[PDB]
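hey team, just a heads up i'm posting the complex here instead of the shared drive bc the drive is being weird again. everything in one block, sequence lines first with there labels, then the predicted structure for the whole assembly after. its eight chains so it's a bit long, scroll down
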Amino acid sequence: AQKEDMPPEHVRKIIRDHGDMTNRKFRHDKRVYLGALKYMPHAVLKLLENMPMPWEQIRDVPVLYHITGAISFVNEIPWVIEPVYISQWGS
Amino acid sequence: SYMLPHLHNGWQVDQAILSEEDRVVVIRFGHDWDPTCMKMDEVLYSIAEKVKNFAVIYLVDITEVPDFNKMYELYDPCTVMFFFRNKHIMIDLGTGNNNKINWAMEDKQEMVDIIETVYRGARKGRGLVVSPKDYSTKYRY
Amino acid sequence: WRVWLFFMRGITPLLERWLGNLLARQFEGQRVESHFD
Amino acid sequence: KDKSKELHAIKERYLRKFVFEWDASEDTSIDYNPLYKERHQVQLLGRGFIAGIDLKQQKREQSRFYGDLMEKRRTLEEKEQEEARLRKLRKKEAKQRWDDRHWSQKKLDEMTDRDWRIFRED
Amino acid sequence: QPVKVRVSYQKLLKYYVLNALKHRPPKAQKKRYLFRSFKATKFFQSTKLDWVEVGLQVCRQGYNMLNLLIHRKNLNYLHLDYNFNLKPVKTLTTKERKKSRFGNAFHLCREVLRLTKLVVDSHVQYRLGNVDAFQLADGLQYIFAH
Amino acid sequence: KDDEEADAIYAALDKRMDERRKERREQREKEEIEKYRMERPKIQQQFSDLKRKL
RNA sequence: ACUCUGGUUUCUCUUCAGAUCGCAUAAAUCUUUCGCCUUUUACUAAAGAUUUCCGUGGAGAGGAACAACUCUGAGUCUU
RNA sequence: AAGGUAAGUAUCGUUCCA
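-- predicted structure starts here --
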């Protein structure tokens, strides 16, 4: 057993369904939805830490998302060669 | 604290509110082991005999009676609620909250002051009485 | 840009605790002279 | 005025509101003596420059003392490459000065899409 | 240089020296990563995604969280817009005004969500051709400096 | 019973997250109060012998 | 110049962390000292002592991928 | 963010829920 990356469009079919509480897919399964919301501010960090870079047009990142689209963490740490980073900011 | 009568389940406190018509029921919700609750559960001791004519004091442990936490907002460590003829007597303090005394005080005269004011305003038939002292500060200086 | 991220790592557990207390099934919420008497 | 200030300093030694801008009373660079009021900036052999400041602005702002020192010591046999490298630099940044030009003196054919956006933004 | 940047130099050095002096060795731990436990949990999935998509996703998620916190006691006279500004739908009677009040923690969460929403919307503006890369960088610097 | 399982999963996850320094912080406080219990003992065992003599 | 030699990468679990864990640096709580001092919630700005948070190093264990292309020390190191 | 709820008596609408 191992963890594999679901197709990128799968999370999009959850967000559209999870636009509001009105959707009838999730009315009684609330103990699993809102429970993850306590970790929401943490997520706000993980993307501002991995925020796309001025020379980077598209910043593809690994994303760890809840099965109900309640949260979407940026499951990465922006490790950068620091001399390269300083040279790039010099340019 | 331990000297005052205690209520064990939800029915008992409702009965104690209902089993009286001519006094005021002063209920100290909280935990008698709390440093805050034990600070004023001795003030309520020192005046229980004095206010026997127009006040009866019952103690309630919210853990023992987890039936009024949500409805009356029992989440401050200590709470005091006044009831008259099965009617919660709102009292206007200096603090924003006007339904309870959620802090433990120190002077045995001021609590009798508040209880007698509540009784006086409840005989008239009010629902909100006004305390003599203002608790928007602590008068410390 | 980095400063607000250090602020973020500072405030992350505070909010992760306050929200947990708020968004839960069960909610929870001059003392020395009262101590030794 | 330095004397009175330094004597006064000797006498000193031996005897709600959400404001974001700091106060000018936290400034510490105030000095009563010249040797610390006006510190000799490091010329750094003339070949070293402060990071943030632009390079050629420092070069023209520089005291030129090492420039005249080099003019004194340099011999003719090794001045040809100095002149050649200097003129080649002047030419290669002249490339940038002319190719990358403001639209005020760039004709329509010279003007490019980036210059078109510059003009439209203006 | 003028006084308003000299004092800036001393105030930067003050915090630098304070951090250097108040530094302590990190405490020994057991290395319990957080997202790794999430990957272990059956409730989460991994996926490669564009960052701007992640920002537009997290903005909606936080907006939904804050609307749930607002409609936690079913008080319909407080409304959260998509810029994370909490406004009344009608002029507040005093009883309802006091009845609908949130502690400093909720306001702090809303404002940090507004900050991340501002950043994400600036990046979206960059991706939609509304602003230039230079404009995007200047706007990001203005956000993080104001 | 899925709600209870989800709540237990999240509680177990949080409890796992506090194991970063739980075993060390609790041991430190255990050793720390025992240094305080020397100068400032407990009242009940201050009255231990008299209670026994009762 | 003959030999045996034999992997690195990746994802986890479990602990130990001396060291700038980190050539970076936040927040909270408590106890003192000021400032303010009008009550909480914010503070004030230094000290000390804690905790959580974002990270890290090492060791071991378990899988997966290059597990089998190699490769390294040893050697008698054979015209 | 607060320390700024007057307490009430009426019919009417709605909705969950028993």
